[PDB]
Every structure is written in C-alpha cells, then in structure tokens.
Design an enzyme around this catalytic site. Structure first.
Site, PDB file in Angstrom:
ATOM      1  N   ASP A   1      -6.284   6.700  -4.982  1.00  0.00           N
ATOM      2  CA  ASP A   1      -5.866   5.313  -5.131  1.00  0.00           C
ATOM      3  C   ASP A   1      -5.890   4.830  -6.580  1.00  0.00           C
ATOM      4  O   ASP A   1      -6.185   5.617  -7.478  1.00  0.00           O
ATOM      5  CB  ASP A   1      -6.516   4.376  -4.097  1.00  0.00           C
ATOM      6  CG  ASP A   1      -7.931   3.959  -4.426  1.00  0.00           C
ATOM      7  OD1 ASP A   1      -8.410   4.444  -5.524  1.00  0.00           O
ATOM      8  OD2 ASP A   1      -8.578   3.209  -3.740  1.00  0.00           O
TER       9      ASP A   1
ATOM     10  N   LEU B   1      -8.858   4.110   2.787  1.00  0.00           N
ATOM     11  CA  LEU B   1      -9.808   4.738   1.909  1.00  0.00           C
ATOM     12  C   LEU B   1     -10.643   5.766   2.677  1.00  0.00           C
ATOM     13  O   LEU B   1     -11.167   5.498   3.761  1.00  0.00           O
ATOM     14  CB  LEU B   1     -10.686   3.686   1.247  1.00  0.00           C
ATOM     15  CG  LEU B   1     -11.908   4.350   0.610  1.00  0.00           C
ATOM     16  CD1 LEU B   1     -11.494   5.107  -0.633  1.00  0.00           C
ATOM     17  CD2 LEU B   1     -12.882   3.291   0.190  1.00  0.00           C
TER      18      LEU B   1
ATOM     19  N   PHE C   1      -8.407  -6.440   2.981  1.00  0.00           N
ATOM     20  CA  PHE C   1      -8.039  -5.077   3.237  1.00  0.00           C
ATOM     21  C   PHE C   1      -8.216  -4.199   1.998  1.00  0.00           C
ATOM     22  O   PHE C   1      -8.636  -3.068   2.059  1.00  0.00           O
ATOM     23  CB  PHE C   1      -6.555  -5.106   3.632  1.00  0.00           C
ATOM     24  CG  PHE C   1      -6.066  -3.759   4.080  1.00  0.00           C
ATOM     25  CD1 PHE C   1      -5.590  -2.831   3.157  1.00  0.00           C
ATOM     26  CD2 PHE C   1      -6.008  -3.451   5.435  1.00  0.00           C
ATOM     27  CE1 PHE C   1      -5.135  -1.591   3.608  1.00  0.00           C
ATOM     28  CE2 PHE C   1      -5.507  -2.237   5.896  1.00  0.00           C
ATOM     29  CZ  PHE C   1      -5.103  -1.284   4.968  1.00  0.00           C
TER      30      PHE C   1
ATOM     31  N   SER D   1     -12.590 -19.736  -5.866  1.00  0.00           N
ATOM     32  CA  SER D   1     -11.202 -19.722  -5.373  1.00  0.00           C
ATOM     33  C   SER D   1     -11.161 -20.067  -3.897  1.00  0.00           C
ATOM     34  O   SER D   1     -10.239 -20.735  -3.437  1.00  0.00           O
ATOM     35  CB  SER D   1     -10.454 -18.428  -5.547  1.00  0.00           C
ATOM     36  OG  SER D   1     -10.729 -17.844  -6.793  1.00  0.00           O
TER      37      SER D   1
ATOM     38  N   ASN E   1      -7.274 -19.766 -10.686  1.00  0.00           N
ATOM     39  CA  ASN E   1      -8.609 -19.199 -10.684  1.00  0.00           C
ATOM     40  C   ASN E   1      -8.564 -17.805 -10.127  1.00  0.00           C
ATOM     41  O   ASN E   1      -9.280 -16.936 -10.572  1.00  0.00           O
ATOM     42  CB  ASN E   1      -9.563 -20.105  -9.852  1.00  0.00           C
ATOM     43  CG  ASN E   1     -11.026 -19.689  -9.852  1.00  0.00           C
ATOM     44  OD1 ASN E   1     -11.488 -18.932  -8.964  1.00  0.00           O
ATOM     45  ND2 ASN E   1     -11.767 -20.146 -10.867  1.00  0.00           N
TER      46      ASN E   1
ATOM     47  N   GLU F   1       0.772  -1.232   0.000  1.00  0.00           N
ATOM     48  CA  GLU F   1       0.000   0.000   0.000  1.00  0.00           C
ATOM     49  C   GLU F   1       0.799   1.275   0.000  1.00  0.00           C
ATOM     50  O   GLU F   1       0.298   2.321  -0.357  1.00  0.00           O
ATOM     51  CB  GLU F   1      -0.906   0.075   1.237  1.00  0.00           C
ATOM     52  CG  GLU F   1      -1.959  -1.024   1.256  1.00  0.00           C
ATOM     53  CD  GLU F   1      -2.980  -0.917   0.162  1.00  0.00           C
ATOM     54  OE1 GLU F   1      -2.924   0.187  -0.504  1.00  0.00           O
ATOM     55  OE2 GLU F   1      -3.800  -1.768  -0.058  1.00  0.00           O
TER      56      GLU F   1
END
Ligand SMILES: [Cl-]
Ligand SMILES: [Cl-]
Length: 162
Positions: free
Chosen positions: A20, A32, A104, A117, A132, A11
C-alpha cells in the site's frame, strides 16, 4: 454512487499481494493484510482470511467478499465508537459515506483523533471542517484521495467522484 463504488474508486482492485501507500502488504480492494515486513507473514494472513492456500493470489469473487466484510466492519465500528457515532448519526447519507471512507483507510482510532474536524462536521460547519481536515498527515500523504473525501464533506454531493 455509494460507499462501495466510492471505495472501489479510491482503493482500486489488485488480485496479487501488493504494498500500500505506506508500504504494507495488502490485497483486493484495500484489504490490509499486515504491517509486518514479512511477505511470508502476509501470505499467512491471506490464507487465513480466504480459507485456503492462495499462494498470494486471489480471485475477483474472493476480493469482493473481503471487501463486503471490511465495509460492514468499518461502518459497524463507527457505530460502536463513542466519539464517532454521534458524528455519523448527525450526517446526511452522502457525508456518512465520506466518514466511512476515512475509517476504512485509517481505522477508527485514527479518525476518532480528528477531534476538531469531527466537532465541525457535527456542527455542519462545512467549509471550516474542510480546511481543518486538510491540516493533516493524511492530506499530505494521499492528497488526491483526501481532496476527494474533503470535497464530499464540503458539498454533500458525489461530484468529486463524478
Ligand atoms: Cl479477515
Ligand atoms: Cl492520493
């Protein structure tokens, strides 16, 4: 290596409001602020988050505080999610960090949507799950990061972060 360091690599750290990969106002370590196109709105959410008039700028300590909160919320959200919890409980410690990384970034809701998945991960079909996982918007939009997380689920080690 650990969840914190892993996310700090993925990040980055920025002390001024920035946008972002998707164009949303963000600050610190991937916190965010809002999906609203309004910078004012962002500034408002930031001040609300920090507890003071920030003027779009925060300190390292403040960023770290948001970060600790968000990681905790991320993990705790997985546990509260009926579709995620089982997956997470079945995984080893490294892979748990991989799943938490996804949560996250994209929210619990978004990850819970990786149904097929999740099933493969739960069955410990590593290579199959990796393939996948790559068939997704997530992989196409942020490929380098997606590759890192995917390798982590594939190998169970922190190599991609090393
Ligand atoms: Cl907050
Ligand atoms: Cl990327």
């Amino acid at each position: 290596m650990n969840i914190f360091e892993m996310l700090r690599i993925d990040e980055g750290l920025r002390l001024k409001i920035y946008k972002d990969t998707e164009g949303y106002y963000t600050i610190g370590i991937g916190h965010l602020l809002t999906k609203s196109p309004s910078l004012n709105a962002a500034k408002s959410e930031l001040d609300k988050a920090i507890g003071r008039n920030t003027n779009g700028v925060i300190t390292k300590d403040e960023a770290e505080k948001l970060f600790n909160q968000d990681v905790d919320a991320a993990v705790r959200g997985i546990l509260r999610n009926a579709k995620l919890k089982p997956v997470y409980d079945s995984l080893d410690a490294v892979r748990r960090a991989a799943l938490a990384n996804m949560v996250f970034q994209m929210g619990e809701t978004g990850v819970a949507g990786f149904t097929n998945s999740l099933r493969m991960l739960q069955q410990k079909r590593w290579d199959e799950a990796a393939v996948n996982l790559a068939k997704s918007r997530w992989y196409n939009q942020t490929p380098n990061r997606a590759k890192r997380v995917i390798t982590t689920f594939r190998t169970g080690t922190w190599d991609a972060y090393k």
